Amino acid sequence: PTAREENVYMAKLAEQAERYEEMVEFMEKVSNSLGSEELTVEERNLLSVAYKNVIGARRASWRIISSIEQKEESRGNEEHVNSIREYRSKIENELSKICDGILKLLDAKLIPSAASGDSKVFYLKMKGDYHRYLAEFKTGAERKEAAESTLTAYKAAQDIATTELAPTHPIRLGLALNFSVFYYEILNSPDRACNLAKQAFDEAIAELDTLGKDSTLIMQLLRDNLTLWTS
Amino acid sequence: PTAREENVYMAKLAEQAERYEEMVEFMEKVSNSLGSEELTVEERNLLSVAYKNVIGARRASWRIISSIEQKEESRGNEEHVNSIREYRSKIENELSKICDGILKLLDAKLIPSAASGDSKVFYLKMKGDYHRYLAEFKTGAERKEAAESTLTAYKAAQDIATTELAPTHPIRLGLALNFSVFYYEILNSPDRACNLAKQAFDEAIAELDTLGKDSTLIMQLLRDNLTLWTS
Numbered sequence A, B: 001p002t003a004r005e006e007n008v009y010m011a012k013l014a015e016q017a018e019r020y021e022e023m024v025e026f027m028e029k030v031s032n033s034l035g036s037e038e039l040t041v042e043e044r045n046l047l048s049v050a051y052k053n054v055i056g057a058r059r060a061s062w063r064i065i066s067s068i069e070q071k072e073e074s075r076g077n078e079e080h081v082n083s084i085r086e087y088r089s090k091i092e093n094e095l096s097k098i099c100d101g102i103l104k105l106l107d108a109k110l111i112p113s114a115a116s117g118d119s120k121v122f123y124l125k126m127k128g129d130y131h132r133y134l135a136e137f138k139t140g141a142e143r144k145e146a147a148e149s150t151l152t153a154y155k156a157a158q159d160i161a162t163t164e165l166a167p168t169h170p171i172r173l174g175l176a177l178n179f180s181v182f183y184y185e186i187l188n189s190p191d192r193a194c195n196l197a198k199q200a201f202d203e204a205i206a207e208l209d210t211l212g213k214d215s216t217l218i219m220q221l222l223r224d225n226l227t228l229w230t231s
């Protein structure tokens, strides 16, 4: 009944109880426990689901408070806008601590332990993902650097994915989705976004057509975003 | 742009962002701010929605971890049961801190400030509600005392409601729902539960039939639970 084994189970209990911050803490220990070896596919995904839910909540709050702010500033009410933005600052604070936690873990333990193509792309995609969440709310040179780190991480992830994983591989397809969402939402470049998404979609269909749920959903998402961006 | 006014708005922003712990903190200040006067109907409900969501999450987690525990102990796996129960203890810890926070606030500021029948019943019902949440997981003499405080609070709430508020009043109907749920779930007495729920339902319909959404839902709930308890 090892510690690592104990933490993984605890993480799954946290997942069932929807106490994601705690789920993160447990998978954080697991990650910091091993040294030479890599996290299992299950462990790697538990950690990823944990952080996704932790940051997802704050991202949703942010979008809502951000929208209130937009409506109130255009309505002229300034006392309200100050309170809104003060509330947003607090949301942005957690977003920064959260991204910082997983990004540090990626460079210190996860990326260095990646021994296969699945592993490396997954972790590099995750790295791009969290620098992308920072860019969603940053503005000055901060946004610039967050945007830069995002592009660097995704390009690296794609170089490995494009050559080592199948076109229909869910991690590769997810990387394409996120990478293209990055061009569209952050770099406000729907041109580069559609080209990338279309290419990934086409390669997947080609493969599916010649030599055959995750891939199906991702591909539908790519499709939805593809048309949605053609307006 | 007063502080109280500022906190109430902040609470509403927290509600939109679904940061309930924070929503509680803001309404906690509002409550502790006034002295002679009472919370508005809006304020009183913001505080109530805040705590409901804060405790609701833990109650849902508890029910889930509690179920895992039940399945694993009957399966014989003891190492798992220890981890489950350890996780539950942590959930129960928050449940106790949460109830304790609102119960203290009720006896110190809220109950003492209640100047009308709406006010008094609302706060006494809330008091019964939180002693009831404690009883849901307690077991020894702890459960006994939690159950006792619950019954005392509800009886007091009902004496006021039965004589000062209309049978169709949502707070009175909610008190009946919760009070009857208490007899059934905590006191495992479906007899006393149905009698109470039926009486409240009948009085409401009588009133509705002679001298005319919240009341409609509550009444449906009373109905659903009424039949559901007839098995």
Ligand SMILES: [Cl-]
Pocket (backbone or CB within 6 Å): A056, A057, A059, A060
């Ligand atoms: Cl989201």
Ligand SMILES: [Cl-]
Pocket (backbone or CB within 6 Å): B056, B057, B059, B060
């Ligand atoms: Cl619940």
